Ligand binder design. Structure first.
Ligand SMILES: CCCCCCCCCCCCCCCCCC(=O)OC[C@H](COP(=O)([O-])OCC(O)COP(=O)([O-])OC[C@@H](COC(=O)CCCCCCCCCCCCCCCCC)OC(=O)CCCCCCCCCCCCCCCCC)OC(=O)CCCCCCCCCCCCCCCCC
Ligand SMILES: CCCCCCCCCCCCCCCCCC(=O)OC[C@H](COP(=O)([O-])OCC(O)COP(=O)([O-])OC[C@@H](COC(=O)CCCCCCCCCCCCCCCCC)OC(=O)CCCCCCCCCCCCCCCCC)OC(=O)CCCCCCCCCCCCCCCCC
Ligand SMILES: CCCCCCCCCCCCCCCCCC(=O)OC[C@H](COP(=O)([O-])OCC[N+](C)(C)C)OC(=O)CCCCCCCCCCCCCCCCC
Ligand SMILES: CCCCCCCC/C=C\CCCCCCCC(=O)OC[C@H](COP(=O)(O)OCCN)OC(=O)CCCCCCC/C=C/CCCCCCCC
Ligand SMILES: CCCCCCCC/C=C\CCCCCCCC(=O)OC[C@H](COP(=O)(O)OCCN)OC(=O)CCCCCCC/C=C\CCCCCCCC
Ligand SMILES: CCCCCCCC/C=C\CCCCCCCC(=O)O[C@H](COC(=O)CCCCCCC/C=C/CCCCCCCC)COP(=O)(O)OCCN
Ligand SMILES: CCCCCCCCCCCCCCCCCC(=O)OC[C@H](COP(=O)(O)OCCN)OC(=O)CCCCCCCCCCCCCCCCC
Ligand SMILES: *P(=O)(O)OCC(C)(C)[C@H](O)C(=O)NCCC(=O)NCCSC(=O)CCCCCCCCCCCCC
Lengths: 55, 87, 63, 67, 128, 178, 459, 52, 125, 174
């Protein structure tokens, strides 16, 4: 018995609002805050992409 | 949210499952067809039928009550009584 | 209409009450409201005293 | 909107939800591509990593062993 | 063939792995029938009282009354100062007291000695 | 839950319960339907292979070994239906179940808010009060002198009677009371 | 203080001359009026107390206790209305007379200016409580409870009388102001040790102290609702008030004699909380929780720092109110089902929503939820104990954890779960019971709003 | 076994730390003597950093 | 992470540098003429800019310029890319100077080891 | 309002940098500030003006009670209850005043730390020294006298401290 139905405007709008914030929020937040720490500009290439490799 | 069950719908679904069973002839199958007396099954087949009904209706039938459901009508009555279906 | 009547009371009355409480009661006592002083950068204009904060040295080019 | 339940069949979908899901997936991938086009340094590094083996004893202030 | 399950106090043996569940004597069947008869008698009495239409109140449970009485009001009359009870009472009632007394006395003596020697950081301590 | 338990489980009942448990845990292990069907067919093949055995001692030994194998090979996190004991939705609606004796403590204004329901409720109460003596008489007539030996209740023999001790079974709260 | 004392001695003839159906109304109304009048004592000074006359004086420690007593009387009257429906007119008037006499004796005890008058009244409070317990208790154990209570109190307090008369002969006066201004240090000798023991042991038996506390469960379980309300809320605070008063003349010997009592009190907090974890009776659970809180107050008084006395006073007031509310809730549940077993009745949140709310609020206040005065007092005591030593923090932390555990355990057991099927006499909550719970709970939150009134004279 | 192994490996990693082949971070004005709360009256021991 | 950890922990820790104790040799040892590092931003300027104590290194002037740029062009936060790059490059130069210091310490330690082994050989024969 | 003493509650002069935009985009903060001034500040200012006009209709004053100085416990004779009572009351008033002085210094320290912000470890070091001195003096005076503190106990503590100081000075310069 297939009762699948996700066409409710409340559910769609809530997930949509939390969905735009999962793409365009880190960029805005990181570009709109002052630098509170010294960045790690210089590092080996295999260490710069360590997270991507393990992921 | 979900539409309520009815006696006719429960009977249709249990007969659907029984007709999808390969060891039962659909032409000689009715709601009063005894699984062992006139359908020629055994205990393991009855257990498998009960498990199929559990999977179909999304709830578990206890073994104390499952060992006594020997008719499609009995299964319908049990499901309706548990789900509080009166029409 | 519903959003207008909701916005006047629920938003406009608390902000009025809180601004009145802060501007005339909380700030009537010393050190109740303390603000971190604004950051002053070289080559700036201090507005209070009409002052000019001078620039830094000449940066050695690093390319 | 009213959706009739289905029995042993694929559920009834909606054009609005289909187009919205496709639009948001496309938006995510477009954003990733656009950011990588402009900010590839954030992923691939910006400045070269120096090789300590290529530094000379003269510039590191290391005298000859005889001294 | 397979590793065996070792029961414990908090990991009791399952009913399907109990060796006595497969070695059944005719006396065991009689005992089971007697247990079922007792349960059925108690159930019948409870159901009669529960389905009585004229009953309005609480069906008093003698088992609950006995449990509450035995756990609270029946302890002292059945107490005998055996060596086990004496040792356990002395330990669990005196040992913690002397342990904490020694700990706190040592800590306070150390603190007082430091204060007297004047090598304890008491600056900004104006609330005691 | 609706059936009175027996004094003991027979060998057939033990093996059937083991078969159902093994099938459920195998389904938990074999997530996909085709794989589950294949291995369930293999399991029933094993059971049918051992089905014919005249030696009850050997049958009991096979059952014991099968139980040990099941306990060793059981799924640590077996699938449980949501409403079944241990399920994620078990006892969820027990807080919404309110009885008719609570229902008769209402205020007259509340009762007047629902006029037609309480007429039928009074009819049910009269029906209950007019049958208790017959129910208790039937119960005390059919019991053995020692007392009940099982938790099974007799039906109503006469046409105008009702099965004894029916009130709470009939008027139990609905599975979704609210 | 006569403006408060005389209206009680007028409550007596009013009660005895009122009509048979108006006794409760008159008593409640005039008790509320007397409480309102007694609210004026909260206007305390900052340096010295209020010296009305040579006999009575009020301090920042006495005023909250007097207000608590005058406020607690009408609630006891309401509970008595609840459980004394079928009593005769004369016996109801006698019960009200006992309550009024107990309140009058408590007021005079709190406002007494001399130690001997304080002792006389503090022992005079025994008679009405014993009569109430042993006469209007419901079960057989009320006689044994009364005997235990009376003899524990007297065995504690007689050496206190001997010490008081000896002190008067030695120094000249037992007036509190004189013994405070003319206080002299107590040397470390056997005679001084035994005088210290006499006074402190009297007040500790009254407190009670762990090991000297069995009378408390015995009396509180078997007493009627009004007796339990007055025993837990006010009569337990006589020991704390006495210790906060009598320790003026016991220094510096208190710095040396406090160790056994401190260890007893802390380990008693732990033990009584653990006992609360496994109690089959609700009233016993509440009584042992009271014992734990009073042990914490004992620790504060014995460490005897300015931050510990404020916490002691706040905790005394908060515990009195909370214990009274808990006893009232337990009595309502008992009167519904006629049994004190905790697991007998369940699903009471399904059956009675508002009572479930009252239970939730009372249990939250019991486990010291901030910013309640319970937490204020407990936190002040914990900070003072931490200054005293740095393992008291460990003991207080484990005590607090177990306190939260048993409070929420009793809440979940009584209110949550599936209701008992065969209990079909759960009638809707009465307006009287709801008003009783509200009048218990609202002053706690108001004192949370204004906490400086119950922090003692060291604030 | 799991908890003991984790504790032992944490101790091993503490006594064999991980770092980068770089020198200590250099700060101006006697390693920020006044900014960290140094006494203005007293004169700190000079800290001089050279180019390389 | 790196080969230096392997060299120090599975090799000659005496020849490998100690990060918590370096530098060990005098700064002028092997440098006939060495120039002291120059700080552009003054203490008062850094204090007024309210830079964090970890941010008050020799690259503080670029950070001050970046902060001033960001504050002035507030609504357009995608503006101070040049200032950000200048600050990043200054930090990169500081880091490579630190790496040079580490390498100098390493090879000075190994040169000391070679010299002392040669001295031991001479003393033996 | 500024109805407090600036010397008692010091505050460094406030230097606010002038706005020097470098972009053509409008300032949402400025627009929202204008909206807030139009919608909130003006109505609350009008309400306060009306209220203060009503207050000035009937203006009455209250005074700060002045307490005379009385001889202290050092001059009080032994077992002289009246003089001891007067000295004890005076000492308690002085104790409360000293507590409020310590509170004032702590408020200064907190305000200075919050104002300086990221550079507090150096800028607000003058308040730290004043607080250290005041705290040390307050601790030395009203140290652990207990919950039953009194002028006599404080005098005994002071005598003990004076004896210790005299003995230390003698053993140093002797
Ligand atoms: C018995 C075992 C035992 O000694 O346990 C100590 C232990 C307390 O731990 P502690 O701090 O190690 O003991 C005191 C220190 O050793 C040493 O402490 P201190 O050096 O700080 O000196 C204080 C000491 C100074 O020493 C003396 O004063 C010695 C002379 C005592 C004379 C007799 C006192 C009679 C009255 C006592 C109370 C009767 C009620 O004080 C006492 O001895 C007071 C004794 C009474 C304490 C209160 C008991 C209340 C009832 C407990 C539950 C009873 C059931 O438990 C008790 O005192 C209660 C025992 C109950 C049985
Ligand atoms: C005051 C409230 C006292 C308790 C409620 C008494 C009345 C009542 O039954 O209300 C329920 C009932 C709700 O209607 P219903 O649905 O018919 O009732 C069915 C259930 O009872 C409905 O029950 P429910 O379970 O749906 O909710 C009832 C509610 C009722 O329970 C409560 O209200 C419990 C509150 C106390 C918790 C335990 C004490 C902890 C210490 C708190 C001290 C705060 C003092 C603040 C000053 C208070 C001054 C009064 O309980 C809760 O919401 C659960 C507990 C929530 C705790 C929240 C966090 C507490 C700790 C943090 C508080 C921080 C505050 C200061 C912040 C400072 C920094 C900004 O209320 C009314 O009908 C209100 C009408 C009459 C109100 C009185 C007259 C008002 C006009 C004058
Ligand atoms: C000057 C006229 C301009 C045209 C007309 C504009 C509309 C008419 C109204 C006047 C608006 C004036 C400008 C305001 C800002 C407009 C957006 C903007 O510039 O964004 C810049 C920036 C975007 O700039 P950017 O950084 O994305 O630009 C990048 C540019 N490139 C790529 C080319 C380099 O956005 C923001 O700053 C975000 C603003 C978020 C606002 C959120 C809602 C606030 C709601 C407030 C409710 C309460 C109000 C009352 C408060 C008081 C209490 C009662
Ligand atoms: C310096 C530049 C960046 C500064 C930070 C910008 C943050 C931007 C956050 C979103 C912009 C503000 C949008 C305002 C939404 C609120 C408006 C409102 O009250 O409701 C209107 C309207 C309808 O509301 P209903 O609930 O459906 O009511 C129907 C009435 N019949 O609200 C909306 O749904 C608008 C749709 C929003 C689009 C999705 C926005 C997703 C934003 C993701 C990032 C936001 C993070 C929050 C802050 C980030 C920084 C910490
Ligand atoms: C309990 C068992 C021990 C107590 C038994 C009580 C019998 C008396 C024994 C102790 C007597 C002490 C005593 O007499 O001296 C105390 C001293 C005598 O000194 P003087 O001779 O007057 O002058 C100094 C001489 N150079 O007198 C006083 O200090 C006055 C107070 C003494 C009262 C006696 C102390 C009683 C002991 C208190 C313990 C209380 C226990 C409480 C029981 C609780 C039970 C639930
Ligand atoms: C070396 C490392 C020690 C680590 C300690 C670990 C915990 C073990 C210590 C506590 C365990 C219990 C011991 C005390 C309890 C008595 C045991 C007992 O009950 O034995 C009695 C009989 O009594 C005895 O056997 C006594 C033997 C032990 C005596 C120990 C010395 C007595 C100590 C005297 C001091 C008592 C007061 C101590 C506190 C004083 C204040 C500090 C009968 O035992 P059953 O249960 O019937 O049979 C079970 C057989 N397994
Ligand atoms: C999987 C794990 C494989 C390796 C297990 C090695 C176990 C032994 C071990 O770690 O030995 C290292 C040894 C520890 O010695 P340690 O306790 O530091 O002695 C100093 C005295 N306080 O370390 C030493 O003796 C010297 C350590 C030098 C490096 C210190 C860095 C900081
Ligand atoms: P129905 O009424 O037709 O009758 C069938 C029965 C079995 C009752 C027979 O009438 C009968 O009693 N026959 C003789 C007794 C007998 O067959 N005994 C042996 C049967 S038990 C057995 O052989 C089981 C062994 C195989 C299954 C082992 C289960 C282990 C797998 C566990 C896996 C769990 C995770 C995958």
């Amino acid at each position: 018995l297939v009762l699948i139905n996700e066409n409710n405007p409340l559910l769609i709008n809530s997930i949509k609002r939390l969905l735009i914030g999962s793409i365009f929020a880190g960029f805005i937040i990181s570009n709109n805050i002052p630098p509170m720490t010294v960045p790690n500009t210089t590092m080996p290439l295999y260490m710069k992409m360590t997270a991507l490799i393990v992921t | 949210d979900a539409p309520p069950l009815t006696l006719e719908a429960i009977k249709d679904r249990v007969l659907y499952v029984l007709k999808l069973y390969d060891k039962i002839d659909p032409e000689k199958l009715s709601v009063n067809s005894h699984f062992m007396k006139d359908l020629g099954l055994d205990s393991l087949d009855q257990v498998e039928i009960i498990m199929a009904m559990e999977d179909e209706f999304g709830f578990e039938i206890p073994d104390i009550d499952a060992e006594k459901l020997m008719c499609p009508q009995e299964i319908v009555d049990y499901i309706a009584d548990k789900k509080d279906v009166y029409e | 209409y519903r959003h207008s009547i909701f916005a006047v009371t629920h938003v406009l009355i608390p902000v009025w009450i809180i601004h009145y409480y802060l501007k005339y009661h909380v700030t009537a006592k010393p050190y109740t409201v303390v603000e971190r002083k604004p950051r002053i950068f070289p080559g700036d204009t201090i507005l209070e005293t009409g002052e000019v904060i001078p620039l830094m040295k000449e940066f050695p080019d690093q390319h | 909107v009213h959706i009739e339940p289905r029995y042993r069949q694929f559920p009834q979908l909606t054009r609005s939800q289909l187009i919205q899901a496709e639009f948001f997936s496309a938006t995510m991938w477009f954003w990733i591509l656009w950011r990588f086009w402009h900010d590839s340094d954030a992923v691939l590094g910006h400045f070269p990593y120096p090789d300590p083996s290529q530094w000379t004893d003269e510039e590191l202030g290391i005298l000859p062993d005889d001294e | 063939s397979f590793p065996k399950y070792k029961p414990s106090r908090l990991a009791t043996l399952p009913a399907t792995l109990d060796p006595a569940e497969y070695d059944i004597s005719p006396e065991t069947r009689k005992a089971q029938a007697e247990r079922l008869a007792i349960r059925s008698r108690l159930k019948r009495e409870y159901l009669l009282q529960y389905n009585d239409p004229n009953r309005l109140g609480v069906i008093e449970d003698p088992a609950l009354i006995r449990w509450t009485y035995a756990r609270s009001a029946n302890i002292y009359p059945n107490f005998r100062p055996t060596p086990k009870t004496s040792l356990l009472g002395a330990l669990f009632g005196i040992g913690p007291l002397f342990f904490w007394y020694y700990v706190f006395k040592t800590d306070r003596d150390k603190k007082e000695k430091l204060i007297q020697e004047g090598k304890l950081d008491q600056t900004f301590n104006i609330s005691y | 839950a609706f059936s009175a338990p027996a004094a003991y489980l027979t060998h057939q009942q033990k093996v059937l319960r083991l078969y159902k448990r093994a099938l459920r845990h195998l389904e938990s292990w074999c997530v996909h339907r085709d794989k589950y069907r294949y291995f369930a067919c293999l399991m029933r093949a094993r059971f049918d292979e051992h089905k014919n055995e005249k030696d009850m001692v050997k049958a009991t030994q096979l059952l014991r070994q099968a139980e040990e194998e099941f306990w060793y090979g059981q799924h640590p996190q077996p699938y449980i239906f949501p409403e079944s004991p241990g399920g994620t939705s078990y006892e969820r609606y027990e807080c919404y179940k309110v009885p008719e004796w609570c229902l008769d403590d209402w205020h007259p204004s509340e009762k007047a808010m629902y006029p037609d329901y309480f007429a039928k409720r009074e009819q049910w109460k009269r029906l209950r009060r007019e049958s208790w003596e017959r129910e208790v008489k039937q119960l005390q007539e059919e019991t053995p002198p020692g007392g009940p030996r099982t938790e099974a209740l007799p039906p109503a023999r006469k046409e105008g009677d009702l099965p004894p001790l029916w009130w709470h079974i009939v008027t139990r709260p609905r599975e979704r009371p609210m | 203080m006569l403006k408060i004392i005389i209206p009680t001695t007028m409550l007596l003839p009013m009660t005895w001359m009122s009509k048979h159906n108006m006794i409760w109304i008159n008593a409640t109304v005039h008790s509320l009026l007397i409480s309102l009048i007694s609210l004026s004592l909260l206007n305390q000074l900052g340096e010295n107390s209020l010296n009305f006359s040579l006999t009575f004086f009020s301090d920042s420690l006495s005023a909250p206790l007097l207000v608590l007593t005058t406020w607690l009387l009408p609630l006891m009257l309401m509970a008595s209305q609840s459980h004394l429906s079928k009593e005769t007119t004369t016996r109801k008037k006698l019960y009200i007379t006992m309550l009024i006499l107990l309140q009058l004796f408590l007021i005079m005890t709190f406002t007494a200016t001399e130690l001997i008058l304080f002792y006389i009244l503090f022992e005079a409070t025994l008679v009405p409580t014993l009569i109430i317990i042993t006469r209007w208790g419901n079960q057989t154990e009320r006689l044994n409870a009364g005997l235990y209570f009376l003899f524990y109190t007297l065995a504690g307090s007689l050496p206190l009388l001997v010490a008081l008369v000896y002190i008067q002969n030695t120094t000249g006066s037992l007036n509190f102001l004189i013994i405070h201004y003319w206080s002299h240090p107590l040397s470390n000798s056997w005679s001084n040790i035994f005088m210290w023991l006499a006074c402190i042991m009297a007040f500790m038996v009254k407190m009670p102290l762990y090991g000297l506390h069995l009378w408390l469960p015995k009396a509180h379980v078997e007493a009627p609702i009004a007796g339990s309300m007055v025993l837990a809320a006010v009569l337990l605070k006589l020991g704390g008030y006495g210790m906060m008063r009598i320790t003026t003349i016991l220094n510096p010997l208190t710095n040396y004699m406090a160790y056994p009592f401190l260890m007893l009190s802390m380990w008693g907090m732990i033990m009584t909380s653990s006992i609360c974890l496994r109690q089959t009776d609700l009233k016993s659970l509440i009584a042992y929780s009271s014992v734990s809180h009073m042990a914490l107050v004992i620790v504060a008084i014995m460490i005897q720092t300015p931050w510990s006395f404020m916490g002691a006073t706040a905790l005394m007031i908060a515990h009195g109110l909370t214990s009274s509310m808990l006893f009232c809730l337990a009595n309502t549940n008992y009167e519904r089902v006629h049994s004190r077993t905790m697991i007998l009745a369940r699903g009471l949140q399904t059956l009675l929503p508002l009572m479930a709310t009252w239970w939730l609020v009372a249990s939250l206040t019991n486990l010291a939820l901030p910013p309640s005065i319970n937490l204020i007092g407990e936190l002040f005591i914990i900070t003072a104990s931490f200054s005293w030593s740095n393992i008291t923090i460990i003991l207080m932390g484990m005590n607090m954890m177990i306190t939260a555990l048993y409070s929420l355990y009793m809440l979940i057991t009584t209110q949550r779960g599936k209701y008992t099927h065969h209990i079909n006499n759960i009638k809707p909550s009465f307006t009287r019971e709801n008003a009783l719970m509200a009048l218990h709970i609202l002053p706690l939150l108001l004192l949370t709003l204004n906490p400086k009134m119950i922090l003692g004279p060291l604030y | 076994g799991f908890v003991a192994f984790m504790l032992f490996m944490f101790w091993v990693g503490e006594i064999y730390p991980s770092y980068q082949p770089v020198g200590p971070k250099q700060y101006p004005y006697n390693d920020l003597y006044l900014e960290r709360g140094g006494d203005p009256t007293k004169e700190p021991e000079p800290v001089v950093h050279y180019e390389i | 992470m790196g080969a230096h950890l392997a060299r120090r922990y599975l090799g000659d820790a005496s020849k490998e540098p100690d990060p918590l104790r370096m530098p060990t040799f005098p700064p002028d040892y092997g440098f006939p003429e060495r120039k002291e590092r120059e700080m552009v931003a003054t203490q008062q300027e850094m204090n007024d800019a309210q830079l964090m104590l970890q941010q008050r290194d020799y690259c503080a002037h670029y950070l001050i310029q970046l902060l001033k740029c960001k504050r002035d062009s507030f609504p357009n936060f995608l503006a101070c890319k040049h200032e950000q790059h200048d600050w990043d490059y200054c930090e990169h130069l500081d880091y490579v100077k630190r790496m040079k210091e580490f390498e100098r310490e390493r090879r000075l330690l190994q040169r000391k080891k070679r010299r002392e082994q040669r001295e031991a050989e001479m003393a033996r024969g | 309002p500024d109805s407090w003493d600036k010397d008692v509650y010091p505050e460094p002069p406030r230097r606010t940098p002038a706005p020097a935009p470098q972009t053509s985009l409008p300032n949402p903060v400025t627009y929202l500030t204008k909206i807030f001034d139009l919608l909130v500040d003006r109505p609350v200012t009008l309400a306060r003006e009306f209220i203060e006009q009503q207050h000035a209709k009937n203006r009455y004053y209250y005074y700060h009670r002045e307490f005379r100085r009385v001889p202290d416990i050092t001059e009080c004779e032994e077992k002289d209850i009246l003089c001891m009572f007067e000295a004890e009351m005076q000492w308690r008033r002085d104790y409360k005043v000293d507590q409020e002085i310590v509170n004032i210094i702590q408020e200064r320290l907190k305000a200075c730390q919050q104002r300086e912000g990221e550079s507090y470890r150096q800028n607000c070091a003058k308040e730290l020294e004043q607080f250290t001195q005041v705290s040390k003096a307050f601790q030395d005076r009203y140290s652990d006298l207990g919950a039953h503190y009194s002028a006599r106990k404080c005098l005994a503590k002071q005598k003990q401290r004076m004896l210790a100081e005299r003995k230390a000075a003698k053993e140093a310069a002797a």
